[PDB]
Amino acid sequence: TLAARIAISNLHKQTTKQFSKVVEDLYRYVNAATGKPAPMISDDVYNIVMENKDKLNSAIVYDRDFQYSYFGFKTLERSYLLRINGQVAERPQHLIMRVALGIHGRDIEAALETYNLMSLKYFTHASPTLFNAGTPKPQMSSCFLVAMKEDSIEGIYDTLKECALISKTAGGIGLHIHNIRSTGSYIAGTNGTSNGLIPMIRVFNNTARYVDQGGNKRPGAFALYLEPWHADIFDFIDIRKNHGKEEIRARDLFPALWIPDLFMKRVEENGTWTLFSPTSAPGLSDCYGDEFEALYTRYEKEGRGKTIKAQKLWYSILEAQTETGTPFVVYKDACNRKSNQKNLGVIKSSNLCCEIVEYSAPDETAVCNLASVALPAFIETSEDGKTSTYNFKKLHEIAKVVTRNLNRVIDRNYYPVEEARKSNMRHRPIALGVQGLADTFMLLRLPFDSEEARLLNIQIFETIYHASMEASCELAQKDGPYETFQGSPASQGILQFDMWDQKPYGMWDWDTLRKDIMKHGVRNSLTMAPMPTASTSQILGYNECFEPVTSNMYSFQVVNPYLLRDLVDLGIWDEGMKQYLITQNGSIQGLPNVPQELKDLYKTVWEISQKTIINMAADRSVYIDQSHSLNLFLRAPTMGKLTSMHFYGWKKGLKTGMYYLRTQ
Amino acid sequence: TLAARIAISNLHKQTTKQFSKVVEDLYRYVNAATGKPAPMISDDVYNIVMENKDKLNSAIVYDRDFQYSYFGFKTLERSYLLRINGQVAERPQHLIMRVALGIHGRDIEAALETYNLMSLKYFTHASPTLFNAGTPKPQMSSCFLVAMKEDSIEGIYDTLKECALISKTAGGIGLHIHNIRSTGSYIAGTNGTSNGLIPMIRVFNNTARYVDQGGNKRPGAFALYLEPWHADIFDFIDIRKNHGKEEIRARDLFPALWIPDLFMKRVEENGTWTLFSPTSAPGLSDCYGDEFEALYTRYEKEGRGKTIKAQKLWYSILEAQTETGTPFVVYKDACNRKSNQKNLGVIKSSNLCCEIVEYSAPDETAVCNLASVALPAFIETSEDGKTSTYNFKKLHEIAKVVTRNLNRVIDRNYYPVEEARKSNMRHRPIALGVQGLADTFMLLRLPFDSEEARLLNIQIFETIYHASMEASCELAQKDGPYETFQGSPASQGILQFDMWDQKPYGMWDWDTLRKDIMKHGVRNSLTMAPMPTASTSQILGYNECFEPVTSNMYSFQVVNPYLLRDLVDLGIWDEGMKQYLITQNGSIQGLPNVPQELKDLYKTVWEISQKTIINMAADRSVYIDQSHSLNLFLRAPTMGKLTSMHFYGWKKGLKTGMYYLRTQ
Ligand SMILES: Nc1nc2c(ncn2[C@H]2C[C@H](O)[C@@H](COP(=O)(O)OP(=O)(O)OP(=O)(O)O)O2)c(=O)[nH]1
Ligand SMILES: Nc1nc2c(ncn2[C@H]2C[C@H](O)[C@@H](COP(=O)(O)OP(=O)(O)OP(=O)(O)O)O2)c(=O)[nH]1
Ligand SMILES: Nc1ncnc2c1ncn2[C@@H]1O[C@H](COP(=O)(O)OP(=O)(O)O)[C@@H](O)[C@H]1O
Ligand SMILES: Nc1ncnc2c1ncn2[C@@H]1O[C@H](COP(=O)(O)OP(=O)(O)O)[C@@H](O)[C@H]1O
């Protein structure tokens, strides 16, 4: 609580103050053990700082280093602040300014604006952008979607190499493997027999452990995508199980289902499902919707696969999620039907955290650059105040700033492999998200499940999508649309919510925007993909992304600051209530002397109906370009509950039915 | 014993008889599950059989199918005889003829000669040649030596792919990794820190399990080579240990030491040894001898590494061999100093079984094609007889036949990767070996450790080397020397034994041969590499390669046929002696009523002095081009014993000090 203004003070004492000097130290750094010059700032950002040192040096407000809570600062200290000899060289303000310069280059005024907005916590960029912006090979991208190059040892190992090269410089990976022939399929060149996915997965698994994001940084992180008809599907979904048969597990990877509607239809009808090897039943990953169903159905009649009962696979899916939190679930038809990149071809996968939906192929590895807007920063106490209100106007303004940021990142990025550069330069996607929706709702006195919260959620996501497309239309006016604009839904005036066949809420003028996009283009094929903010939310001191809090009382013991305020304000906060909190896993329900309104406001995710989560996810989804990383939380899980959740999500038209399933 | 002329009879009944018809069945075969034409004979060998069916069909003697003992036939049945639908289609004679045609093509008379000699068991070819000769992509090579392409993720994964592609089509691999920076070395592109060899080994390990020699054929089989100065050396040697720390072991691979003399010198002097990362101490793998010692010594003074006591590494080497049989030991200086390929550059590794010594680099993967001569087939009962004698003249004749065979294999081979083709076409090495030396010695009434045996060993290897170079000089006269002949020791008249600074035994006219090689060249850079014959020896029914028997009584219980003969001939073979054999692990020493001469003749390897093995290995080594796969066998092992063995071998100038160390 106070140990923050204590440990930040210590860094100040143990660090150089003047920004242009820290930059000098970074830039002139030599790796001692090898005596090699190891500059930690690009030449270009170095020169820019030296030619602007007074302006740059004087713009920085180090008081702002005290915006960070204790965990936030320590998060910054451990992994983000550049170090010289195991000693931290950057103060948080310094990091921020390096990033704003990393992103903006010669445009100093744009860099100053980003410095102010980030230092004041209106928004942040994703971890890799913070780690690497303004450094010599700035790999600022968070996400890569990799296509298995070919069903051959040559393509498998070309793919493995690619993944290694990517993991080297710190992305997370989604990799689709639908085209690999299954167990027992014939191998012609040697008259042999395939052992299927598992032994191939195990090679990728080891690669992930080996290539730890730059040498002792973080284990490689790959999610694998598979359509539920693949004949190896039962072992794939179990890849994370704790119990026996070590040679058949792949514990360092994450399995994801790329589900066609037909699977769901068959599950609900209590029908049959057919398992195929892709050699016997080709092209299934390369179509979707009615076209997929006609193709699948024919192959199924032609006897080309093995028939089981659908509900047998399902029950196994459900078992695996209950035990491991995986596999993830992303609906292939929804993704494909409702994607502005549909003119590129069929989208075969999502990504490590199920927010990105972008087209990939053997020659194109889809990329995304991310940032998240801090939703609390736009609450103003009103002019009388106390009403508090929500400044949608400023939100719109900042989302436009961040849009332009993520666009510069595209052009200034170092891409690990050529397949990533080719994709990104062509198609130009970007990913805006949010953090602290829970905090916003709290501050404003709205319960998560309330109709008021429902409305705010809709308006926030409408404003972010509108702002991002407005900014992207602006950039297309200056710089031209992205190469692949023509033929896109957006070129026809079909925007995300149109694809859900809905009217927009209408807080913004979508018609003028649409008129404008049709005439001038947009600069980015996609703009929205709300992400977990698993790390960045913790730097800023807010609840991750768009989920309710999991607990009003984490563990160092820290009680929800909004709840604490309230308890003291009511003459009820004593030792007998702090007790009823570490024991109650952070709940206040049923608790004796506590007003109903606080109970309704400080509900945990474990106490909110997942029908409420799904509904709200489905509401904002009309304003999301890509998808979003929808964690599901079940207290006492049953197959019946799990089933109704997936199905409710599925019939709502979600793209990401489920990220992790969390239990207790 | 009789179950052989029973199970062979059954195959006959269950197989088609006429050779050209089995060929027809093979050639017209369709993979049923996929309906793809899967011809199991090349077009070229098919056409040859059809244009010569009477001659081919009538030359075959199916009585010869009864040359094979019971284990031999079953070995053939399980893995070698081509199958159509899980049913064996080839009789052994058929296999033999396919191979002779696979090797010889249009030269029918050469094919007939090879058919007679193989069917009559004068010699055989190595497993891959038997599996694949005359099939559509005939990969007949047994050995590949792979250079780690570069100290980078790009080169590591290009290497991994290469190994996969090779393993696909059934070779064994030696891979040298001396150039990979060790644990804690700096990584510049990302300001990180290396985790060294182990996590990289684990990726190769998984690849070996995955790529099982054509799809369900046999696990991948890789040996790794490392010079004992590499800073990761303590964990490398322990890679096969059974006990804890699973993440640090690599149990599906085999570690091999590539030892400079200096290591040994330092061990014996009780001196220091210095551990380096190759980034801090470059070029050590790229020189040998005095040049290596001056370079190593300087780096060691310049403080570039970590200093320990030599005997600490050694003791650990010795511990690991005691427990796992590994690491193998091959002396880098001996290999390099005494190699006809020395004009190519520094040889950085041996192979999976430590018999091959060939140059490899990022663009050249050394290859070898193998065959073994059955030493027993050249015993004739003499003209009066009973003396038995040894027909050195026929041995010479057959070795010349096999030389020409292995040369055609080179030209007719399908190479899995371009690096293997480039090497093999340039340099053209080949590998002759032997099987049943133990049987030969027995039949002839010579104890393994006798002076008579010593002499025969010297003469056999002299005759094989002479014959092989004679034949290879013949081919150079027709076809030109191999591309890289000029500048070689052999081009200067320096033959293997010259490099040991020895005179040849002189049973053959080496001077005329030398005159001839100097004028005309040889077709192959190398010709001799006696191999384990771990499988092929068992097909023919003889003791593997050049080792004494391990036991006069294996397990189906089978007693040494030469010993059995003797016991019945002496009125001593009863139930009380068969007993003293299953219990005595197959020994006859100390046994009451048994003549001294039989005790001396039927000594086990466990009862022969390893000084005798080393001596005899050192004797024949002067006639070996490459090296040979020298297993060592110790009853009750101690550090002192193990040490004197390695050192005695080392001072004898051996190339392969040790293959496996076997214990009990
Ligand atoms: N376990 C195992 N799997 C293999 C092996 N070789 C290939 N595979 C798998 C990898 C691919 O999914 C599939 C086909 O591999 P390739 O395309 O390299 O085989 P190839 O072109 O020789 O035969 P094809 O014409 O594709 O049937 O079989 C092997 O040696 N062991
Ligand atoms: N554990 C781990 N090892 C790595 C990683 N990246 C590279 N290595 C190892 C593999 C090589 O032995 C060595 C050098 O790798 P690279 O040549 O790909 O690194 P780079 O060229 O970026 O840096 P350099 O100039 O070579 O120091 O470090 C990593 O992300 N994790
Ligand atoms: N452990 C990880 N290693 C590498 N990349 C990751 C990891 N966790 C998340 N990512 C990448 O960052 C993206 C967004 O994740 P998020 O948790 O919002 O990241 P952060 O908050 O660290 O910026 C994911 O889609 C994924 O590609
Ligand atoms: N398990 C194996 N897998 C692949 N190759 C092997 C294996 N064992 C031996 N080899 C290859 O064959 C060579 C000679 O071995 P040997 O035991 O004489 O083979 P074989 O008797 O089967 O022909 C070795 O140097 C190695 O490269």
Ligand SMILES: [Mg+2]
């Ligand atoms: Mg193929």
Ligand SMILES: [Mg+2]
């Ligand atoms: Mg490098």
